Amino acid sequence: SELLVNTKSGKVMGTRVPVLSSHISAFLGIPFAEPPVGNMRFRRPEPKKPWSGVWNASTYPNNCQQYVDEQFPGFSGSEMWNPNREMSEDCLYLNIWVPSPRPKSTTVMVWIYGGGFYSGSSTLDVYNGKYLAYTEEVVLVSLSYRVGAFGFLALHGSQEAPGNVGLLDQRMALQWVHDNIQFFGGDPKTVTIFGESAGGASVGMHILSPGSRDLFRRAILQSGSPNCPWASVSVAEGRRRAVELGRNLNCNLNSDEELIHCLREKKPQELIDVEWNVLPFDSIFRFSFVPVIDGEFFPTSLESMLNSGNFKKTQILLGVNKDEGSFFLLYGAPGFSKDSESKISREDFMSGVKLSVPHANDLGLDAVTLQYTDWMDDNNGIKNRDGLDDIVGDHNVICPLMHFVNKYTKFGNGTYLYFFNHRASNLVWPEWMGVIHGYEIEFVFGLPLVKELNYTAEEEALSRRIMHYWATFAKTGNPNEPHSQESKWPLFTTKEQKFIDLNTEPMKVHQRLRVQMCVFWNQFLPKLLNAT
Amino acid sequence: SELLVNTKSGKVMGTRVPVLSSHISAFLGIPFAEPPVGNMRFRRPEPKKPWSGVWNASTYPNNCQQYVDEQFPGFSGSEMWNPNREMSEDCLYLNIWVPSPRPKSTTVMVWIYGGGFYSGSSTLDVYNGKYLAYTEEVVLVSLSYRVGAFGFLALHGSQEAPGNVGLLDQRMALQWVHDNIQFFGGDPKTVTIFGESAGGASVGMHILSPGSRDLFRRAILQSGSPNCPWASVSVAEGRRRAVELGRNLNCNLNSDEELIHCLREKKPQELIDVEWNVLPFDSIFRFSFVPVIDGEFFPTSLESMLNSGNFKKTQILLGVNKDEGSFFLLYGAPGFSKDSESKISREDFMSGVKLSVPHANDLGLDAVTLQYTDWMDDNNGIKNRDGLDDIVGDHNVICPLMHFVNKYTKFGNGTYLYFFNHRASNLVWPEWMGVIHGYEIEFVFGLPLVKELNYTAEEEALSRRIMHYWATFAKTGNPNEPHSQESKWPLFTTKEQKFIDLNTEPMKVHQRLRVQMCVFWNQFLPKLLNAT
Ligand SMILES: COc1cc2cc(NC(=O)[C@@H]3CCC[C@H](NCc4ccccc4)C3)c(=O)oc2cc1OC
Ligand SMILES: COc1cc2cc(NC(=O)[C@@H]3CCC[C@H](NCc4ccccc4)C3)c(=O)oc2cc1OC
Ligand SMILES: *[C@@H]1O[C@H](CO)[C@@H](O)[C@H](O)[C@H]1NC(C)=O
Ligand SMILES: *[C@@H]1O[C@H](CO)[C@@H](O)[C@H](O)[C@H]1NC(C)=O
């Protein structure tokens, strides 16, 4: 039957799902790892023992244990990111949307969710593969991985909690797609992995890590970048945070075996309750347990890997949203509130600059401030608010991604760069927040096509325009249709540095995206801080 | 007779001079000090022994010994600043233009020439008091002072070369005006001292120095400021430069008496030949022998004097030109030439930034560069050229003057601030140079009124407009006529920070003149350099 597939791990039985007055197939909650529970918590992932019989792969799986956002209880804008299924340490599953009929060798797209490495779910309504798989004839796959302390506790030199295991989770799901996607009609030599936020930093991490490169063909990174300041810590810092997690749960801290044993005795929610207490600074856009530069998953420092062409050479498609910082100021910066225009006093701007660059000494704090303050009108709370939005977007997302895209292009086989600056017309967050972090996802997955979600026709036009760029890129390494009538999304070159707009207005091409500020973040401020 | 005046130092006989189809009186080359020759070279000035008989005060006096510009031999644009009379160490004289008939108590204006403390002449055609004295009924006085090593060699703790003597020259001329200007129909309680460049820094120095404040009423500073980075050195630096002058002339350097004796044996031109060899850096807009912060003329550091209201509280009128730096790049920066548009390579911009901020470490050099580079179009030789013009104007003139005007206004009785941005229509320098340092002088002295110098009628209108602002300010402490029809030049307040334009277009009022860049120069870069 269509909904029955003989994989190398065993048979699985999916279900027929409707999608825009037609139907396709779905295989939800397929295991790719052994459940990482008990003594396996914090351990590298093991591959799922193959099973006899048939797996009832018709319902979504548990979500992995994480912190749940309750800043705005009941508010859909915040709830759509929380787990919509019960949480279990047994989260290692993946979901396949297959067109119907089952093709024989179409393009495969693997989705990697974000959420700062401390949260995420493959099962969110905004991650639904069906609209994309159906509209573009691709096989859509979404994996899951251990987040939080469960996926990134880092006592290096120990083999019980080596770090990076949530990436190894991702890797094993990618190994399972390479081995088995052919039985779902997927071409295992045409897998494009894409992600956003932490998931975009993951996608670019698999580009760097050698153990990962041969498991996928090309890559899409959305608002994420392996070298983001929040995406990785050093071994010393990862150890310190692991030890401090132990101290919050009154653990014996003498040996690494003593810490790890103590942490496995604890229930999940006990580590989540104190997870945020181990950050070294008062900060925004910093998360506790993140990938560690370990010498194994990452052979050396990320900057030397980027300078020395030490990474998978292929094509990449990547880009940013207009107002990336505003979501994070809402959560931790003083002055901002969901229900005001959040005009920002001179004094609260000062406070935001501290929380955005928590590693900076006073002289660096002054440098940031000078660079982002209109001094002809300093006490303007809209200019102070918008300025903060740019401080957090540039430092944390846009400028580390530009650095990545300038370093990668020097050695790669193609690069396509976008600037998504369309405020969705049905957005529940205040208008001061602009074009929000993670709000292009709904267009990439084609939710505008559900003309029951209140979307303007132009936005459906935009979602189809975008979904085609993505799929055509995953299929060929160029989002442009050969012999096509629309304007061509130009390649990004070190010489000309072009990129395009993604909005309902006719496509436009600019260059050197936010270079002015990105010179400051990528080259000046690091030099200043290194100087004492 | 009109041209005969009985001063406290003796009678003097002036001459009748024509000025715009009428006539007034002039007393040229009146001594106010003993000739500072032989053993008096480098010494504080002594007052002119009074004389029997009558002084033939009808011809201009010698100019003081200085370096003569020969970068452009024959070119009037450069020659109009060189000495037009033979040079003598006996330069201590002053010149009075008196209206006719001799008024009884009109306003007195004393002019203090500039030229980096290393050059200047009271006798230049652009300093002619007659057009101003006649048009505005004021008594115009111009002093002279020892420049170069002759006026500012600084072996502190010695009484033979204590430093600052060229300012004491100025002071004695001001004491002579206070004592004697009443016999020329001048009101000695209404003396406004004005100057440009070094002369504007002098005017503001007499505001700070206590030994000077009671000798003048109010003050005009043009493109000059006591706290300019070139206007003063520390005692240690002034000693080092004095010792290095000795080393260039093969002097015994053991004792201060030995150095000073050796330097007095030398002819003047021997010190001028090597004067530039003692600067500590490769620089532009730095001069060898300048005022020294000595504890006497200046009680303490200039910044503490400005912070602690330690200065003459009165009214001041001051301002800057649009393109102050371009004159100095022409002389020492690579890429610039009198006869090209001087488009500036990326590499030669780099070189200019070095020569403009010679005291800055590499990190400071990067800060300047970042702040003044359009990174969306970095290899634009017009933007690099104009950018350099602003680097040198802001650092050396505009931003130290804004600092002065922000500190002085906090404690003073009035402040008026101008931005002179009219390119004179008959200017012999290339158009890339813009509105050049020291090219408002010709409007302040009313040379546009000579409709035989090729000036547009609008410019005569501007010169009369400006000459009236100056004189009416000197007379009252407000450039505005009471009950007048033109727009009012607003006072400068710490709150609103207004200022006006000086050009042929109808007057306009802006605020916070070049604050963006001046925050960087006055508050950020000093913090950065102090930090290691
Ligand atoms: C003391 O440190 C704490 C820090 C934080 C940070 C929280 N959240 C966030 O930083 C982010 C902000 C941006 C919106 C994002 N969700 C939407 C989203 C998800 C995925 C992709 C795209 C968009 C939540 C947080 O919920 O709780 C915290 C609690 C803390 O202590 C108890
Ligand atoms: C190695 O250091 C040297 C440095 C210099 C600098 C010279 N000149 C100037 O810096 C200035 C630049 C601006 C134009 C001004 N004159 C017009 C002016 C005069 C008064 C008020 C306003 C305007 C001359 C110079 O002539 O010769 C130099 C020779 C050097 O070594 C032999
Ligand atoms: C699969 O599990 C769900 C959830 O309990 C159940 O409702 C469904 O009928 C099951 N289907 C099969 C074929 O086992
Ligand atoms: C003053 O000196 C000049 C220059 O030598 C001379 O030509 C002039 O006639 C003299 N006048 C008097 C009155 O001495």
From Swiss-Prot, chains A, B:
Terminates signal transduction at the neuromuscular junction by rapid hydrolysis of the acetylcholine released into the synaptic cleft. May be involved in cell-cell interactions. Disulfide bonds join C64-C91, C251-C262, C399-C518. It comes from Tetronarce californica. CDD domains: Esterase_lipase (cd00312). This is Acetylcholinesterase. Glycans are attached at N56, N413, N454, N530. It catalyses: acetylcholine + H2O = choline + acetate + H(+). Changing S197C: Loss of activity. GO terms for molecular function: acetylcholinesterase activity. Pfam families: COesterase.
